[PDB]
Amino acid sequence: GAMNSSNYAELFNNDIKLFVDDTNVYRVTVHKTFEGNVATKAINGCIFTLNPKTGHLFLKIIHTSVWAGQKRLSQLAKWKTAEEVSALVRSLPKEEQPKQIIVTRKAMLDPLEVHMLDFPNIAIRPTELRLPFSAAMSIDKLSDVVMKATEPQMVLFNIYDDWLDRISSYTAFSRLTLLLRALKTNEESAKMILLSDPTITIKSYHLWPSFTDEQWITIESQMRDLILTEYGRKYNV
Amino acid sequence: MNTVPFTSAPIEVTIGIDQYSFNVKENQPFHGIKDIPIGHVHVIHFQHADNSSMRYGYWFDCRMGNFYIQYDPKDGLYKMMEERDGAKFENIVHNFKERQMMVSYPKIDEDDTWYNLTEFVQMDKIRKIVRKDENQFSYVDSSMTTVQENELSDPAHSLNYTVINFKSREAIRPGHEMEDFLDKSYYLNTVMLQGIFKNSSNYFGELQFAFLNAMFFGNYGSSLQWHAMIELICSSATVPKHMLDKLDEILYYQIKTLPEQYSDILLNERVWNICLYSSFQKNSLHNTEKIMENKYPELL
Numbered sequence: 001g002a003m004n005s006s007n008y009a010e011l012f013n014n015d016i017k018l019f020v021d022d023t024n025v026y027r028v029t030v031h032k033t034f035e036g037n038v039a040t041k042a043i044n045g046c047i048f049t050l051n052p053k054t055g056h057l058f059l060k061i062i063h064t065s066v067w068a069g070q071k072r073l074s075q076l077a078k079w080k081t082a083e084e085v086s087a088l089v090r091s092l093p094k095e096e097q098p099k100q101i102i103v104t105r106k107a108m109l110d111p112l113e114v115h116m117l118d119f120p121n122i123a124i125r126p127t128e129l130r131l132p133f134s135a136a137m138s139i140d141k142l143s144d145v146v147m148k149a150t151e152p153q154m155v156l157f158n159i160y161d162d163w164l165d166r167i168s169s170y171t172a173f174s175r176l177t178l179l180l181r182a183l184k185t186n187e188e189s190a191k192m193i194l195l196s197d198p199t200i201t202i203k204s205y206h207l208w209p210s211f212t213d214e215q216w217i218t219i220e221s222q223m224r225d226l227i228l229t230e231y232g233r234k235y236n237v
Numbered sequence: 238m239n240t241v242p243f244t245s246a247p248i249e250v251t252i253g254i255d256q257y258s259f260n261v262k263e264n265q266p267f268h269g270i271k272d273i274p275i276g277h278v279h280v281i282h283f284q285h286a287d288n289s290s291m292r293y294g295y296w297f298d299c300r301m302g303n304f305y306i307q308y309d310p311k312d313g314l315y316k317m318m319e320e321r322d323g324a325k326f327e328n329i330v331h332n333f334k335e336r337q338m339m340v341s342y343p344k345i346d347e348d349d350t351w352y353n354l355t356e357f358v359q360m361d362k363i364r365k366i367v368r369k370d371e372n373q374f375s376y377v378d379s380s381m382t383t384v385q386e387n388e389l390s391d392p393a394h395s396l397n398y399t400v401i402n403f404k405s406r407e408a409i410r411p412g413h414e415m416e417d418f419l420d421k422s423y424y425l426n427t428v429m430l431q432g433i434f435k436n437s438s439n440y441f442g443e444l445q446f447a448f449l450n451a452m453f454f455g456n457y458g459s460s461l462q463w464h465a466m467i468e469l470i471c472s473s474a475t476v477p478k479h480m481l482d483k484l485d486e487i488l489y490y491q492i493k494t495l496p497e498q499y500s501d502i503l504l505n506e507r508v509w510n511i512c513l514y515s516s517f518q519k520n521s522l523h524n525t526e527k528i529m530e531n532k533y534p535e536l537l
Contacts, residue, residue: 079414082414111415111418113404114418115414117405
């Protein structure tokens with residue numbers, strides 16, 4: 001049924017699976033109108049669809065035009081998500097199609113199940129994990145492509161850069177969730193940690209800095225420290 | 238007025254005839270039920286004093302032949318049977334009536350309870366949900382499974398209810414996923430009413446029959462069918478005005494008749510709250526909503 005820490009290594013077996021996060025699909029800024037009422041203005045969004053074994057990210061950009069003249073947008077956003085994931089699966093050759101799709105929010109279960117009625121052999125699953133995929137838009141290059149899009153667009157990334165050349169997907173995923181957890185708890189502190197030594201650069205074809213193995217331990221150490229402090233402050237403990 | 242005579246009552250049993258019920262003692266001189274109104278279906282049902290498990294019974298229409306009950310000491314139940322010899326039957330019944338060995342179907346004249354619960358129920362449609370085409374009457378019991386239950390085990394001894402599944406290619410038009418899931422009008426009107434049921438009467442017929450099998454036999458699969466057929470209408474934005482007004486009356490009488498002490502197991506919290514408070518039809522079931530609020534305010 002649901003995915004948790006008791007069946008965690010399942011993510012890195014050889015059954016093709018995808019995580020779908022819909023937390024950045026429908027994005028708004030809230031502002032005051034001239035008459036002093038409140039209004040939303042939609043900004044570009046994205047579906048975060050990640051193969052946790054390979055690091056392949058299918059970033060579907062959600063252009064604000066998709067909301068034009070629509071009602072109940074938070075509800076449409078889940079159905080638009082399910083529609084795009086489904087279109088994505090149908091676009092893949094059969095041997096590349098996922099055997100499971102894990103949604104980060106339980107409200108995506110019924111939309112995706114209905115859009116995938118054609119694929120009874122693809123299991124649609126929730127998770128009890130609290131994954132920080134919401135922080136995807138704290139990654140500069142992903143935020144950049146979303147905010148510049150003038151039309152609907154699908155951009156493919158490897159969210160692990162070249163890490164799997166040196167580490168397993170269990171470790172690459174653990175580094176990713178640590179990075180995104182930090183970015184989610186204090187974007188500014190996390191971002192300072194990642195770019196503080198301007199001798200370490202991000203390659204044109206990568207998302208993250210080109211850290212040596214020892215530099216990654218230090219960085220990883222600093223992200224944990226950041227997460228722990230913020231937690232003490234939050235809860236005064 | 239029709240009569241269902243009994244050969245004898247060899248085991249102590251609670252006998253139901255529609256909404257009525259009588260206790261008969263082991264070997265009590267009991268020879269059946271007279272003054273059964275013609276023009277309606279009826280159900281005659283049984284719960285043995287020794288096994289309050291396996292409530293069972295017989296849907297029948299007195300216009301379709303001469304029917305009697307005989308205890309089978311091999312299979313251990315009261316069996317419905319047809320007497321084709323008209324004169325033997327007339328003669329059998331007259332002896333038992335003269336000896337006053339028969340209970341009277343105790344209809345109150347003002348009381349339209351049974352008509353209101355069976356208005357759309359047709360014996361010929363029951364014989365297609367319960368397939369035993371060699372009998373004019375249909376056996377149902379507590380443990381019989383539905384065809385839809387058997388999909389997720391004996392196909393002969395099942396309730397062939399119309400399969401309703403809100404997450405099915407049948408119920409969802411490709412490219413109308415969100416629309417058809419949040420508003421089932423197309424599943425209700427085109428697929429179910431126009432395509433399968435042909436009219437609202439046959440839809441209400443199965444609905445009323447599912448409810449009565451739930452109530453009289455505690456048939457779990459029937460209870461699921463009854464709720465499914467309610468939910469399909471409550472979750473449709475577009476329903477003919479006459480269907481809604483009639484559904485409100487149907488459910489009012491079903492809720493009125495439910496034993497007070499059975500609301501916990503026969504009523505699905507989520508379906509009723511949806512219908513009465515959340516769904517498109519929340520303002521459309523005035524009678525049903527008033528009786529549900531005054532009689533089962535806990536559930537909601």
